[PDB]
Structure formats: structure tokens, C-alpha cells
Amino acid sequence: TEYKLVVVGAGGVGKSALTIQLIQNHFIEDSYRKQVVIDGETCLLDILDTAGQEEYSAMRDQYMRTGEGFLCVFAINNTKSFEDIHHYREQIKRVKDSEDVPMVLVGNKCDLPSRTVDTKQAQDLARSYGIPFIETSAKTRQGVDDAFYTLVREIRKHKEKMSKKSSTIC
Ligand SMILES: Nc1nc2c(ncn2[C@@H]2O[C@H](COP(=O)(O)OP(=O)(O)O)[C@@H](O)[C@H]2O)c(=O)[nH]1
Ligand SMILES: *C/C=C(/C)CC/C=C(\C)CCC=C(C)C
């Protein structure tokens, strides 16, 4: 089953470090296909890190149109990046013309000792949007698989609910 995952969020939150951790297992390509088993389903993940494409209107429009699920990433040490989440969610909702888009809120760099965003205010925001919240470190790999696999589960849920031989001569 093919799932198209898009990683969005402010410059510097660890969107690239997260994608590279998931794919290559350590801490210039945009889009990558990785094959994985999740809850016993054989999955082909098409993952776009939006770091390069975000600044181009037509690219942004296109990855929001074709994207099936969105990791919305902020850094727990960057309040501005937490405030930016609502802008990303509002763009994705407008481009899809939908209220029901698979999304996971991700608070990255949880390995840092220097937090400026309370877990509670992130938990409250996720609840207000009706979406899962995951704390990750691309550095230590904490929560990384959980964050991507949760988003696959959200796309799976969305498809589960979303759901003639003819004659040419006659
Ligand atoms: N300590 C720590 N640093 C991180 C983490 N993720 C990314 N970084 C660093 O933060 C910076 C921005 O990462 P990058 O993946 O390029 O950000 P992007 O612009 O969102 O792709 C880089 O210097 C990374 O090494 C993390 O989980 N913990
Ligand atoms: C759907 C209509 C047709 C253009 C073809 C109908 C088939 C014909 C004339 C012959 C069929 C042959 C047998 C039933 C033996």
C-alpha cells in the first residue's frame, strides 16, 4: 500500500534530520520511497521533506494537493515554530478544501535541556485539532518511527472511512 507523507514546519525544526533518521538510521534529496511493515501491513512510504520546496508557491500547492498525510513539526526550544503550526495546518486545509486531513503534531529536539514549549500546551493544541501529538529527537531517534507510523495509521483510518465491465464494439 502506498502512503504519501509530507513533513512541514519552520526552517530549523529538524524536518531533514527526522526524514534522514527514519530512512538512513543516523543523525540534498527532497523526496524518498522507503518500504516498511507497519502493524503487519507491507507499506511503501513516499516521504517529502519540504525544506527546499516550501519557498515555491506551485511546489507548496502541489505537495499539499498530492500529500495524503502531514507531519506538522515544531522544535520544543523555538516558540515561533510552535506558533507557525497553525499557519501550516490552515494552508493544508485550504489547498485540500477539507476539514479531515491526516496530520500528526510533532515536537522535535526533545533531547535538549532548554525547552520553551510546555508539553501541556502542545497536548492541548493536538486535542483542539483532534490529532495525535508525538515528542521526537532526530538526535537520539526517540519517537521517530512512532511519529511516521502514527501518520500512516491516520492515513489508513482516513481511507478506511473514505470507502462495471463494458463493451467498446456494442
Ligand atoms: N539536538 C537536536 N538537534 C537537532 C534535532 N533535529 C535537528 N537538529 C539540528 O537542528 C538543525 C536543523 O535541522 P534540519 O533537519 O536541517 O532542519 P529543517 O530546516 O527543519 O530540515 C540541524 O543543525 C540539526 O542537526 C534534534 O532532535 N535534536
Ligand atoms: C453487442 C452487439 C454486437 C455488435 C454483437 C452481437 C453479436 C453477434 C451478432 C454474434 C454473437 C454470436 C453468438 C451469440 C453465437
Residue numbers in the entry: 2 to 28, 36 to 171, 179 to 185
The study reports:
RAS is a major anticancer drug target which requires membrane localization to activate downstream signal transduction. Phosphodiesterase 6δ (PDE6D) has a beta-sandwich immunoglobulin fold which contains a hydrophobic pocket capable of binding to the farnesyl group. PDE6D binds to and sequesters the lipid of cytoplasmic RAS and has been proposed to deliver GTPase to recycling endosomes, which is followed by release mediated by the small G-protein Arf-like 2 (ARL2), allowing RAS to be trafficked back to the plasma membrane. The resultant lipid modification increases the affinity of RAS proteins toward membranes, where it is required for signal transduction.
While such high affinities are challenging to measure accurately, it is clear that the two-point mutations dramatically increase the binding affinity of KRAS to PDE6D, up to 26,000-fold, when compared to WT KRAS. To this end, we determined the crystal structure of the full-length KRAS S3I1 mutant in complex with PDE6D at a 2.2 Å resolution. The crystal structure contains two copies of the PDE6D:KRAS S3I1 mutant complex within the asymmetric unit, where each KRAS molecule binds to PDE6D in the same conformation. With the high level of conservation in the peptide backbone conformation, particularly of the surface-exposed residues, the high-affinity KRAS S3I1 mutant may serve as a surrogate for the KRAS WT:PDE6D complex. By introducing the KRAS mutations that increase the binding affinity to PDE6D, we were able to successfully solubilize KRAS(G12D) S3I1 protein and retain it within the cytoplasm. Nevertheless cotransfection of PDE6D M20K together with KRAS (G12D) S3I1 resulted in significant reduction of the phospho-Erk levels.
